[PDB]
Design a protein around this ligand. Structure first.
Ligand SMILES: CN[C@@H]1CCc2c(ccc(O)c2O)[C@H]1O
Length: 281
């Protein structure tokens, strides 16, 4: 009786993700006032979220609700390659957002001419290619496979498609896709908050007669709660095999998948954007 118990939520999630992504993309597309150097970065985020939601989630639902795929093996590798690429692209885009916000706040005088409209696009390219260097190239090679006899019936046979990783690839992907962005964001937002506190103290000193905490905390809480637990167990299993079970791993991956739907509300709020949404429909 759980056939409809689990799966309707998946349909709701995918529909919500698609609807959220398409509105942001068309709002950037069709209105002139929205275009800016910052919005170009969010455009890649929206496109990547739309691609991932349209690609990996609906097919993953079939794998969840049935024993295994009715599909091919190269398609299994293709799905596994798309998922990691999407996740790492999202992480890198968020890191770039934090960096450019820091450049804006800290040194306004040089910011106006630091980031030209043209050169900005270049950095986005330097994101995706880097992601590709960890997404398609190692998956198509033998690095995705494992040496242990268990799951050989998965990699070297047709029906099974579950994920199995060698020791090196898991830790390398975790180091290159999660921890470096986090160690960037923590320090950079600490500096931004210190600057904001200093400014508020100066304003209070000027004229006798907390927004920043909430504003940064919503984003930090959403991101850290969404993605941190997965990349602990990701290192752990590979480090030690006995501890974890598969279903918990899948659930922690899925709760991270929800971040794609969760993000646009946190990372997109402006009166101009509100007017643009109001104009549509
Ligand atoms: C099947 N889902 C995959 C499995 C492993 C993995 C993911 C994302 C980023 C990585 O660096 C990974 O190693 C997950 O999205």
């Amino acid at each position: 009786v759980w056939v409809v118990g689990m799966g309707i939520v998946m349909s709701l999630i995918v529909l919500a993700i698609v609807f959220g992504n398409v509105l942001v993309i068309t709002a950037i597309a069709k209105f002139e006032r929205l275009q800016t150097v910052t919005n170009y970065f969010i455009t890649s985020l929206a496109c990547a979220d739309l691609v991932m939601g349209l690609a990996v989630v609906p097919f993953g639902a079939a794998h969840i609700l049935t024993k295994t795929w009715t599909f091919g093996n190269f398609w299994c590798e293709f799905w596994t390659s798309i998922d990691v690429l999407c996740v790492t692209a999202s992480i890198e885009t968020l890191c770039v957002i934090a960096v450019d916000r820091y450049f804006a706040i800290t040194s306004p005088f040089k910011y106006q001419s630091l980031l030209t409209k043209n050169k900005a696009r270049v950095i986005i390219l330097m994101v995706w290619i880097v992601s590709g260097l960890t997404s398609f190239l190692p998956i198509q090679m033998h690095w995705y496979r494992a040496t242990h006899q268990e799951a050989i019936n998965c990699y070297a046979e047709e029906t099974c498609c579950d994920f199995f990783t060698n020791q090196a690839y898991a830790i390398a992907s975790s180091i290159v896709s999660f921890y470096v962005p986090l160690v960037i964001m923590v320090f950079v937002y600490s500096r931004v908050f210190q600057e904001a506190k200093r400014q508020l103290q100066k304003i209070d000193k000027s004229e006798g007669r907390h927004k920043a905490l909430k504003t940064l905390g919503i984003i930090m809480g959403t991101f850290t709660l969404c993605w941190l637990p997965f990349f602990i167990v990701n290192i752990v299993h590979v480090i030690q095999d006995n501890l974890i079970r598969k279903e918990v791993y899948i659930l922690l991956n899925w709760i991270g998948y929800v971040n794609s739907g969760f993000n646009p509300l946190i990372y997109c709020r402006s009166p101009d954007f509100r007017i643009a949404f109001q104009e549509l429909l």
